[PDB]
Design a binder for this molecule. Structure first.
Ligand SMILES: O=C1C[C@@H](C(=O)O)NC(=O)N1
Ligand SMILES: O=C1C[C@@H](C(=O)O)NC(=O)N1
Ligand SMILES: [Zn+2]
Ligand SMILES: [Zn+2]
Lengths: 361, 361
């Protein structure tokens, strides 16, 4: 068929596990998974080992990413029980601040949330892992401190309808939804098993999944929440939560597009334009993705690149394939082969156009 | 000594267990405990059996109270998973609506909270059991629906500082604190035991208790959260949470007054004026309480009137004693003897001055 050209897509929620969890994934394998999924820019979460909750850990993570990343990236800082008010000099160099309100870096009191909202620079992003009533609680803190907040992986009818009500009142809140909460449900827990199927937020009911689709207008971004764990860990005694998702996100969503569940533009708003404008991420010159919307295939037991080496979407039929990715003028991916080496990717916050504009302080 | 005359005090948070739990307490014994504590008006919570979540249950509870109460009263309605939008004709006859966000009547989703805030008459009280981040979540719902909310039994530094921040922004929120969260702490769990010491909100740290005192200006009301359970239940296999408190609240607070921890006026604001104005409760004619602030005594293993027949304040030294209570021109209590019979008390919402003023609908 004739290929469809897309801009370089952005995933604002990936866990690349480097430093400290490199058997699950590292920058080189995670960004290869990204490129294979049509993603040319990722925002990596801070719950690594050591966690990115201070300047030295950020300095280390930056060098590991610059040395191992194959696509471009930005790095989140994590809010901790100790670092409120201490991140002012490095905050602008990060993708944003992740507030983990379920990895929590010791944050346990709403008063600590307030301190972070008061001290983190007001022009820079804050994203929150907040489930069920926690969405309401963190929105309240955002209002008290009169600033915006971005809600990670919305998974429930309860949560999306709450955000819907907040937007109707004109509040500055945006949100993202991950593909497993659009394409998997309780109906899949029998096949997956209790170990494999462990994820946070957990899989929703059919009614939850139906509510997210019905309220697509409320969803600002799609993001994978790529959370790689080995099969041994997912099936073991204390299964960690999370799915790998970089290599399956776009095929799943392209399938929905070909079925008329959302438009191609609807998809590009949520994987390109809205991530750009929420996180102030720069364009990528000479960067685009070529996909084939006619190719039907079945998702295998594991995708080629993620070290997780498993996938909960196994056996699902998809229509849509990433055929070629060009990143800043170089062929990065073609028909299953990655052609840019570790270290090709760059930190977008170091580009002149990647700094977040602010009033002169 | 010369006795100090106080107005008739109000406890806006009591569990009187009738109907359905009359071995723990009934209207006659609970209101005798109230009168012995200097309390002439109580607001009874709806988590009885059957719970007061519909008009027939309210009609039954009203008659049981009118037949058994020795002091005056109002009855809460409970928010349920089914009764949002169905309480319009009886709402004005209730003390208010209790939202139980820990007895929960099946409410589990923030969307259900919103429905109650949208449907309950906007001029009538809503109180919420909300702990830790739930305080923030329900405040958010109050703002979305642009109305006030009253937070029950604030127990933590985290909660009182959050409410403090909300009041600084001018939000319509009030709160109450119970005596066990001012006069007991973790330091008392060894003596109490894990069964006796079970209460929700649980006992706080020294730092929690210190924060509540330091932020007394943020506390609108004192209320006992009188939650009677028999000693057998408190010490048994599945201990229910709660303390009896009607007979000990005022002696404990009068002790703090004599120690200069708060003024007598500070006390009367929180046990008389602010309860009046938050819940639109009418004055009680020819009603007053005479106390002796010099009499020192030690709290015994159980107080005379509550069927709970135990108390977690056992062994605490207090200075201050209720000597006499007059209710609507009749001696109701004198030196340990109750002299008004069951049925003397009335439903204050049926008085002309006890209806909540509203714009003509
Ligand atoms: O909150 C999270 C984080 C993630 C991980 O494993 O890092 N995977 C999950 O399923 N939930
Ligand atoms: O929420 C509550 C309710 C009360 C009861 O037993 O009814 N006692 C408590 O300790 N917490
Ligand atoms: Zn995540
Ligand atoms: Zn209560």
């Amino acid at each position: 068929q004739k290929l469809v050209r897309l801009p370089g897509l952005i995933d604002v929620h990936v866990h690349l596990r480097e430093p400290g969890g490199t058997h699950k994934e590292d920058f080189a394998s995670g960004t290869a998974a990204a490129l294979a999924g049509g993603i040319t820019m990722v925002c990596a979460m801070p719950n690594t080992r050591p966690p990115i909750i201070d300047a030295p850990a950020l300095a280390l993570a930056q060098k590991l990413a610059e040395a191992g990343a194959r696509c471009d990236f930005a790095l989140f800082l994590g809010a901790s029980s100790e670092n409120a008010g201490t991140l002012g000099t490095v905050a602008g160099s990060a993708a944003g601040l992740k507030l983990y309100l379920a990895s929590s870096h010791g944050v346990t009191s709403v008063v600590q949330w307030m301190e972070h909202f008061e001290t983190w620079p007001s022009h820079l992003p804050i994203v929150a892992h907040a489930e069920q009533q926690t969405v309401a609680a963190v929105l309240m803190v955002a209002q008290l401190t009169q600033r915006s907040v971005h809600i990670c992986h919305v998974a429930r009818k309860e949560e999306i309808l709450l955000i819907k009500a907040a937007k109707a009142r004109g509040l500055p809140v945006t949100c993202e939804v991950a593909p497993h909460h659009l394409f998997l449900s309780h109906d899949d827990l029998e096949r997956l098993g209790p170990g494999k199927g462990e994820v946070r937020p957990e899989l929703g009911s059919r009614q939850d999944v139906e509510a997210l689709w019905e309220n697509m207008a409320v969803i600002d971004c799609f993001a994978s929440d790529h959370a790689p764990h080995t099969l041994e860990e997912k099936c073991g005694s204390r299964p960690p939560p999370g799915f790998p998702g970089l290599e399956t996100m776009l095929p799943l969503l392209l399938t929905a597009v070909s079925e008329g569940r959302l438009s191609l533009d609807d998809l590009l708003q949520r994987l390109h334009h809205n991530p750009r404008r929420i996180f102030h991420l720069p364009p990528q010159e000479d960067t685009y993705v070529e996909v084939d919307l006619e190719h039907e295939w079945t998702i295998p037991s594991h995708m080629p690149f993620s070290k997780a080496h498993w996938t909960p979407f196994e056996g699902q039929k998809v229509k849509g394939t990433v055929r070629r990715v060009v990143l800043r003028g170089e062929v990065a991916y073609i028909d299953g082969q990655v052609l840019v080496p570790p270290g090709y990717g760059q930190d977008v916050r170091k580009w002149p156009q990647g700094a977040v504009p602010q009033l002169p302080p």
